[PDB]
Each structure stands twice: as structure tokens, then as C-alpha cells.
């Protein structure tokens, strides 16, 4: 993928990947999406 496709997707490896993910993490919209699933949800995913 890297040799064929360039400057389209950014990849990493290890804990640096987690750090870069947490740099762009948007927690409030994820909280809103989880609340939306709370309003309409069933099963063990509900507990999730």
C-alpha cells in the first residue's frame, strides 16, 4: 500500500500510533454517540 499509494492515509506502529490517535481524538462527540446508543440499544452492546 505504501509503495503503490502515497500521501492519502497516515499510518504508524506502536504506542506512537496511540499517541497520534489521542492527538486527534474528539471525546465529546464519542460521548454523544454513546448516549445516542444508550437511548436506542439492546443486548450486551447496551451494557457495552
Task: Evaluate whether 20 touches 12 at the Cβ level (below 8 Å).
Answer: yes
43 vs 16: CA distance, rounded Å? 35
Among 24, 39, 40, 42, binds another protein (CB under 8 A): 24
CB 1 → another protein: shortest distance, Å? Answer: 9
6 counts as binding another protein under rule CB under 8 A: no
Among 6, 11, 28, 38, binds another protein (CB under 8 A): 11
Residues that bind another protein (CB under 8 A): 8-22, 24-25, 27, 48
Amino acid at each position: 500500500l505504501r509503495d503503490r499509494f502515497g500521501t492519502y492515509f497516515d499510518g504508524s506502529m506502536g504506542a506512537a500510533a496511540l499517541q497520534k490517535r489521542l492527538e486527534s481524538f474528539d471525546l465529546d462527540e464519542e460521548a454523544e454517540r454513546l448516549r445516542e446508543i444508550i437511548r436506542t440499544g439492546k443486548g450486551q452492546k447496551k451494557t457495552r
